[model samples]
Target: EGREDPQLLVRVRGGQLRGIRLKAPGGPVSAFLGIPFAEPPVGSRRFMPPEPKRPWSGVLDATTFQNVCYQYVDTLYPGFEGTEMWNPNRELSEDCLYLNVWTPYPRPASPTPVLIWIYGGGFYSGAASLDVYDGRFLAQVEGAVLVSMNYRVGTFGFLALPGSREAPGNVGLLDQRLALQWVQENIAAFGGDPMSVTLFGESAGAASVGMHILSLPSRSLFHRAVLQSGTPNGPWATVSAGEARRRATLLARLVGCPNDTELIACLRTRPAQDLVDHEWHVLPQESIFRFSFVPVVDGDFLSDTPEALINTGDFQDLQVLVGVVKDEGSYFLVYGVPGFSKDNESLISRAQFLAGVRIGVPQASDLAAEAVVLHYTDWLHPEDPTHLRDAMSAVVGDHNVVCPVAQLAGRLAAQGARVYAYIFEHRASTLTWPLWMGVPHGYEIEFIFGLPLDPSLNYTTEERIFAQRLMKYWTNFARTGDPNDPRDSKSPQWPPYTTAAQQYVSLNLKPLEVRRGLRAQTCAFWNRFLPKLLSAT
Candidate 1:
């Protein structure tokens, strides 16, 4: 008898879900797309915590990705050409609580490690269905299960107000927490081990992962964590509770919901576009690439500031892999708003004038500003400063991304914890690094996802091997909590980081060697001066 096979059908808490199976170079992988994990946060549910999805009756086909969260028009960076970075016309919906899974072996006798990805869009715009974020290649190469989930963002996620059942704040964080709970309860059916889940993200998403590591409620949800270029302790990661409420009030006025008591009801009924359009202006811009709306201290989720939590050793005992690229600050120059570019004199002048204000020191004195300029003065041309853009890059890189991650890793390692640090330095293709600087903000995520670069820049056989090994390290860490293999003589040996040792592996094109203290001098200055200066002022 000739009958169709039912190999792709998976049963879970909701109902029977149907997925697609694809042939890969390594082996065949199953793709379960658009599986709803929570009820749509719409109508009365708008701005409220996510509710668990109701069980469905019949088999649901999950062959296509659902619409992305309702968001503002997509942005194109200054130097980028065409639609090289992002898509502006993806479908939008309020019912975006879906998660995707790519597994080489689902429901095996021995379960595989699961990787849950939370994307970063300045806490504004991102989609799990982006082609650049495809997980098939990782599934094919590594014998592991890959998972990516979508949570509410922008106003819908982080609007904190002072009302009952209104804007409690951290609804977006609650959504991610729910998605992890769903993975814990249901991923086993797809051949993933519930206990071996590894949580990872980039930028705002990476900051979210850091928040989770400190939150007591999500302690048992995941065992390992990875942060590409963000940490919860940075200046831009959060705002005070009072400031958060003030921003919400401003957005309410922008959308004609000026009343405090009825603001929640008015905002729920307003058009999604109206709310998104006001997202950029709700909080006044203090710097380039600043997130206007972000997470707040809600007493329950974020009990206090991220630094206080780290100082008190409040985070869970988890294996961590955190890193930054060579040039993380060049991002602000090209990402949306104008910044310190190769030629832009505005941001540089602002830094040279206000000094500490642009560098997250709000109450910097005139003397402090002079010291700041002195730090960035070109050693070659002390009398007449040259390379202003390059000097500011080092300062911004240390202040925002690099120094924060280094402190996080240093703190964790000081406690006798297992942690690893790195710097991504190679560029496989165009868009791999900055257009003019060393390496850009979003370079590593593209390479980790295994996306192709520009065809114009040809690759060598050795370059291709390095790319493969880079991805190998990513999945290997996801599975074993270690990025290197002592037994595998071909790959680089990434030693465990320590407070005293202070070593980092440079992901170079030539053999991906380990180089200690790549930028330790600049990092040490930030660690020593900025905090003491800010506290004194």
Candidate 2:
């Protein structure tokens, strides 16, 4: 610590790593990329829990991002260009269990908070190396250590075989667990406080955060959590153990492996890309709410259903920040079901809307579907095509994301956990979507990652200010479980949420305003009314 070297060398528990320094607007930031947290899950190790990485000899060069988990980049959805942004820009490989870290270069005298990011790709595709997740600006400006890890995804990461010891499911989640443990054991050397760790993510990543918050095995990994636009309680978040087994068997048969006791062993021998290619062959039809390979109630990783667990179990005493956008379903409408893609064409029809409601809301019975229609229908103009489209988006959005997030927030608050809720309604001027789309899912991520602050993107002066404000709020929470900073009088005081008040801070261009009852009636229809209807039926 006497004199800083031009090439910063940090010694983690595993070994010495030579990281690179970058020039930032605020200050210089040291970046350690592609650091291994787990051994390569190849050969016999495939389809099993991640093995912790052993110490390496000599100084391991950790200056650049590494390969992403093996995945086929194809046009899965027609007429939607949004999927391209999340695609892996690096090569794909089986040896892809690495984590990245960014911190202020000179090192702060006192240890700072740590923020770890998990990405969202429906548990099938995601990478920490994506440009949008770069943490240099946030780490340097906000005074924290930022880390992101690459976990296994798709069939390789999620294939489940119930009681089979050879292939226990949710290895992807186990990979994330190992990464968190890596941070705990090694982050202190990076100028981060081990006790003040905060885990955050969006969509599937957010659901992963929720799973960690609920799992008894993962309870103490992180002290705080931020769930952005996802919840473990969402229907698409998991599949049943039996369903998981069925999918695993289907993948084996599709890839020329016998579906017998030797299924797991045979699958390990098949080409990794072939397994990923046949993941969709397991599903009979296109389903938005259910995936072929996802997390399951395996009685170990997840003890029970998310509903039962949230209602009965005692969660960690954690401070939680959760939120949803105004129009989460709009993204799905264009990507998953392209019938609603054409803005000039007739909006969703009554029959089309009902069919989507059934598909969008998992395990919804006939009565539940009708109840959803009744609640979301624009009564004054039931036959209006535009209104029907709006109603359909609301139903899909509420059931898939909004209502589930609200339920999770309410449950945590009920258990005396500190909870803060929010609704992101800010429509970015840069987006070219139709006016009716409002703020779609994953839109707030740009501001959260300080994208607008990048001058190359040509973000307007106001846009930069907006991104700066968001970075402050997010990092403030990472620093001290509360998003509000008394020193910063520009931003409003973000109120703590409770079931009775249901208060939340609305983030937009205007001054931050505290509001209550975010879709109270609509959420009630989803969280309470529909569940009772299905149970009774």
Candidate 3:
């Protein structure tokens, strides 16, 4: 066939199919792209668990992009603006259960380890085919097979309705599971060692990865896992199935539908813009609006929180790497409503109250608030007088982002796995206002993908070197379950994580080793506060 490039192939599955090719960085290879792992969940199948992709007879042309999963208009981060690699303006649909793959040395005879990527966009946006997610760099850079995929989002992927026997909750998780099954069955065709597969993701994707770690269905599918910047131990991690159903019913009423079936049908028939508009209306009021459709705490798929599962020693015994960035809350502070006060006394009171240090200490609230202002303000804007604002940001960042990850690491270390934890502290100059927001959340992503930072900001020569070093570490991890060792001579020695003495490699302006205890202090305060504050929310 003229399509045979010796590096790429047109794989046919069911009646629909797409193109895949082997990626040969310095030698021969074979690869496939746009393959359907599950039947598109559209029309009658909308909101249901993924169905098996029907078989196709003739060779199916799969050379182009598929529809992205349905989503609302994204205005959250400015960083998403320029990346044309994934911003395909094509109409989105419920029938979007597709995935893409890249292999370094594709062969039917020899099998290599596989790495599957789950993307992060707060569970509403992002695609597996995004430019930043391109596995070519990782594949060519390291001789490992890579897989990237797309799943349901927003209403189509996460909504749960009453008497919805047809559609169970966590369809998104099911979609991910289906994709992994596909790899286990067919990856050998691309020279991948399916048994040695590793699952990894960041943020929402990382949260999902954590779910897989705790899922019984996914137990034998993956051999290892990595979670970056997202942990499922926090209040926002999982919601009850009953609550998810209640939210779905409310959403149906908001959309002017008479019943659940009609609402599902109407949503299936409605224009993407209409859905987007509805999502916008409910997004602002996070309390009552349940349409945010994240994974549900159904007794079947997600039996218990990941923390509970880990603590009980029910988790898969695979090596893990987990960590969060410095100043994780700065972006949230700038974007969210301002907190209650500016005084150090107020901050400390709030912190104490939030941490449940004293049930009804007269000054507890004030002291907690003051502590937040002091810690974050001092760390982020040492000279800034906007003490209250800085404190609020710190509180959010510590509780939501930093503390959860650190707690997970400490717990996992306690349970015994070669766990390596890290704190990304490289700040970008383009970051403005409030404080410097050093190493704001998601800052390490570009470095992980080996992409350049915003050009508008001046990057010191040292920054470039740091990016390369970080990439080397990540790719090394992807290839060998350890980020420190590399085939290249320039790679650094990274030690495995152990609790006897906690050690973490800090990826700052320069890579350095630091005691994990230093980072754990900030989290300890939040752990004390979680039961109370989260209970209130």
Candidate 4:
């Protein structure tokens, strides 16, 4: 409730934290780095929900980043392939339930808004210390307290077993909720308005944000949320209790242990590497349980599936901004598949790739698959063989990310929810990797962080301006629940989204414009038409 402390020290829920000053775009800011929010998950505590870290004895040094939760170093799917884009620092540890804080505006007259971020790595790997997620610039410009926390991933955090006290699921989400609880109890010491906190992230983290909206206990923890490229409505988001137990049994067998009596006990004793190997295993005939390590319906943290909950409007009513990238599916095809790197790539391989595009799409009937191809095949021009891969991405993106999200958004908006939607399509020239990646999945993270430029590829007159303006929209929304405010007169008035008109913010090469009917035809085929056609649930 006071101004910025020049000496850089503040007492939080646990102890007195020593902060450090950092240079930021807006001004010099205070950063309290690496404060433990939960006890280390080790030995017998593995696979259990997070527990609060005991308060410290004296002044704890709050500098340097804490270790990230253990994840596959190489790659379970294809050798830590796509993760290098975000988690450049491939470090790991089990004692990783720590959070960081950045206070850019020290002596604000009133309490500044708060923005807590969640990272994403397919629920397998991610860290808050990524260079791309640096809170220096965004926190400074937004004049809001910024926080990023590390949560457990993979089997260590999400293995669901039958026993009551042994191995239950949704521990990752429970870790997240614990960190939010810390925010609620201590953000005020950093000059932040706890009541106006906005939770935001990309990919699995975005899905986590949506899950918080559905999970009742965690719902009121935040004032609003921004979901980019993911949501709880994901087809593979939840698994049945029986299915979770089956997977647990499978993991026990794969790890050279008994499938029955000692399943949970065996899993708890196994090494971390033993389970990371099967992180990408898709159950036979079950894309419903696609990712081996994912959140499950424990009948506790999550009562019902996101579909059943969102169907009847059981979610907390808040200002929501949810949308996907122009080519979110490109990431899967680009990294998940093999043999597409050729000057003269053939259409034959495209057919092969298309054959298994339903690897993670639930209820993908043969006819539904064909109908999707019929709708998107034009995107893959026969003459332009390069278009084949891009087109495959289009179909997969629509089915997995776009349609479900749009349908869920429609349901919420139709019920008079104050929802805003958007599609980010800005391609970074400095980040030449994105050219082939195709404005790919999770591409908007760097932009949202408002990072500095490459001087040549990224520092365009247009991009710099747009990036700043974009930062305002986000921070403004955090403050006023609307993206537009007194800060920027240039940014367009971002309107509320609904099933009717289907308006969304189109952030592209041109000026920010409200686009009507983003992928309207394709969304219809997947959400409305094909569901009835294929008898999809």
**Most lDDT-accurate candidate:** 2
Model 2 Cα lDDT, one tens digit per residue, 15-104: 999888976776788999999999999999888899999999888999899989987564754344455667887889999999999998
User: How many residue pairs clash per model?
Assistant: 1, 0, 41, 4
Best by TM-score: 2
Which is better, 2 or 4, measured by lDDT?
Answer: 2
Q: Assess each prediction's global lDDT (C-alpha) against the native.
A: 0.75, 0.84, 0.65, 0.75
Relative to the true structure, candidate 1 reaches a TM of 0.90
The segments of candidate 2 whose C-alpha lies over 4 angstroms from its true place after superposition are: 1-7, 72-81, 259-261, 342-346, 432-434, 489-491
lDDT string for model 4 (344-455, tens) is: 2434355654564555354677777666666766543653546656776676677778877787778778765778888988876555343556687777787777774323
| Alpha-carbon lDDT of model 1 | 0.75
Q: Could you estimate the TM-score for every candidate?
A: 0.90, 0.95, 0.81, 0.91
Q: 2 or 4: which has the higher TM-score?
A: 2
| Per-residue lDDT of model 3, residues 1-537, tens digit only | 564554454343354343555333345433455677788787777778898788867766655556788886544444444223335454676667777767664443467778898987667777776656656555655566788778888767777773466556788888999999988887776677888888888888888888888888887788888888887676456667776776676666677754566667765666655665675454324221123678888777888766678677633366788878876655543333323221122233334323321221112245564454444555554544455434544666666666777777767777766677788877754433323454666667666754443233355667656766776666666556787654554644566666567677777775466654635666666676635543554
Clashing residue pairs in candidate 2 (N, C-alpha, C atoms within 3 angstroms): none
RMSD of each: 3.3, 2.3, 5.9, 3.5
Worst 10 residues of 3 by lDDT: 355-364
